[PDB]
Design a binder for this molecule. Structure first.
Ligand code: HEM
Ligand SMILES: c1ccc(Cc2ccncc2)cc1
Length: 460
């Protein structure tokens, strides 16, 4: 008849007192035990429908694309993004900005861009003389630069303190959003928005980044050559000029700054966080890293830079990376959707504008597709022959009309960066493999590995 079943809420508090202090995901997994794969949780003042397991998620996002393709808000960042840029946009705005962003994210190839950065990385790693480091900044630098060369038309130097400062702001912002306070804000932002909190810090952090984008936009405006756009910013300026007599053009300055922030954020914090978990995992499972290195020796050798064409011949490294993405579960609850029209779903009726969380973690840890899903195991992506076994449960980019638009770039990045590093270095740290704790630092919107030190030791 009406909504999916779930725990009875209270006025004001919704289902607070039935939640798990450990976080939203935990709370929803305990609801799943009781209600199955489709259920409603009242997050403070409203109902949110949760969909779990790959069948239910694909049925929503793919078979019912017409209904499930809207974007819900993330309360920690809505006040800043306010429905601007491709991530947080709906309706015609989304259509326009998605199309724009997909097209201009192809148009020097992305591969060559990543291969070049990979060489600067190796260089930077050789200069560190196997010193200990927390590699967050470095993994952010390499991925940010890929997006920077596309968006801004250049890369930044690794020791540029201003680049650093922006990366430190993404890092902090993503943690803050994913923190327990940020998960609470999701429930009670109406009330909490009047007090001091991490929500004001996030807001401020994003504004500092946006100010640089502001500047760079103006620099681009002044030096723009309409016959020779240099990058994604130039290209958007030209759409803007072309549509200036339409006051309702989506090619506005607010979309330009926030679409640009969106890309920059997505290109700096996703892949880098996955690599950071990946290198923690190589420290804890040195046998896996050793086996990857053997396949690199055999398929690539020690000198020739890895290339995307190498992937087909390296099923073991590919499986390891799939397993790194599966285990690291970057966005356990994905990004919020909303239904754009009244829909019937498995006998339930989900009114237009109901928020829908698609619990990607549930697909990724599905014990029918992955034997032992809480363990890190590259055999999850291998057949008996040792050939790559892809699976439809593997949905860490989501599915359907909102499927991550950086999937191709992200996978290229993970492959080239992971292989080029292990080609040239092994890893060490002062924590014994058996003592390494993989428990995330935060687990909210983002799952965020703990900080750790690592050394990269040149091979000889
Ligand atoms: C490990 C790498 C990445 C992962 C796991 C990832 C994951 C995701 C997920 C789960 C979504 C939400 C889809 C949904 O609403 O159902 C998403 C959205 C998005 N991602 Fe990624 N992403 C990654 C990297 C990137 C990169 C590198 C970029 C940009 C170059 C990017 C750009 C975007 C954009 C623009 C959206 C919003 C799509 C839309 O609403 O139309 N992502 N990503
Ligand atoms: C809000 C939600 C997600 C993100 C990171 C993100 C972006 C694009 N694709 C994957 C991850 C930042 C802010």
């Amino acid at each position: 008849g009406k909504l999916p079943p779930g725990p009875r809420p209270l006025p004001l508090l919704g289902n607070l007192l039935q939640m798990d202090r450990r976080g939203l995901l935990k709370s929803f997994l305990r609801f799943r035990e009781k209600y199955g794969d489709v259920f409603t949780v009242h997050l403070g003042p409203r109902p949110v429908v949760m969909l779990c397991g790959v069948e239910a998620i694909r049925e929503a996002l793919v078979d019912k694309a017409e209904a499930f393709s809207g974007r819900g808000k993330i309360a920690m960042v809505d006040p800043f993004f306010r429905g601007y840029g491709v991530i947080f946009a709906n309706g015609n705005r989304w259509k326009v900005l998605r199309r724009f962003s997909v097209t201009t994210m192809r148009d020097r190839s992305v591969e060559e861009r990543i291969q070049e950065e990979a060489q600067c990385l190796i260089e930077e790693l050789r200069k560190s003389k196997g010193a200990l480091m927390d590699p967050t900044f470095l993994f952010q630098s390499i991925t940010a630069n890929i997006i920077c060369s596309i968006v801004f038309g250049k890369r930044f130097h690794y020791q540029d303190q201003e680049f650093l400062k922006m990366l430190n702001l993404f890092y902090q912002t993503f943690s803050l959003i994913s923190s327990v306070f940020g998960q609470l804000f999701e429930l009670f932002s109406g009330f909490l928005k009047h007090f001091p909190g991490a929500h004001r810090q996030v807001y401020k952090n994003l504004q500092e980044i946006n100010a640089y984008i502001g500047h760079s936009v103006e620099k681009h405006r002044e030096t723009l050559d309409p016959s020779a756009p240099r990058d994604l910013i130039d290209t958007y300026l030209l759409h803007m000029e072309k549509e200036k007599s339409n006051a309702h053009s989506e090619f506005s300055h607010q979309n330009l700054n926030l679409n640009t922030l969106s890309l920059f954020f997505a290109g700096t914090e996703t892949t880098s966080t996955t690599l950071r978990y990946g290198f923690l995992l190589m420290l804890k499972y040195p046998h896996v890293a050793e086996r990857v290195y053997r396949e690199i020796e055999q398929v690539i050798g020690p000198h020739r830079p890895p290339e995307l064409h190498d992937r087909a011949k390296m099923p073991y490294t590919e499986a390891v990376i799939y397993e790194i993405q599966r285990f690291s579960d970057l966005l356990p609850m994905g990004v919020p959707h909303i239904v754009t029209q009244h829909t019937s779903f498995r006998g339930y009726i989900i009114p237009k504008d109901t928020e829908v969380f698609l619990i990607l973690s549930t697909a990724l840890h599905d014990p029918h597709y992955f034997e032992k899903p809480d363990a890190f195991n590259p055999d999850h992506f291998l057949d008996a022959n040792g050939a790559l076994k892809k699976t439809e449960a593997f949905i860490p980019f989501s599915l359907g009309k909102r499927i991550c638009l950086g999937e191709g770039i992200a996978r290229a990045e993970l492959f080239l960066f992971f292989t080029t590093i292990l080609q040239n270095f092994s890893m060490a740290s002062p924590v014994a493999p058996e003592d390494i704790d993989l428990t995330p630092q935060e687990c909210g919107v983002g799952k965020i590995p703990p900080t750790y030190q690592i050394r990269f030791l040149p091979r000889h």
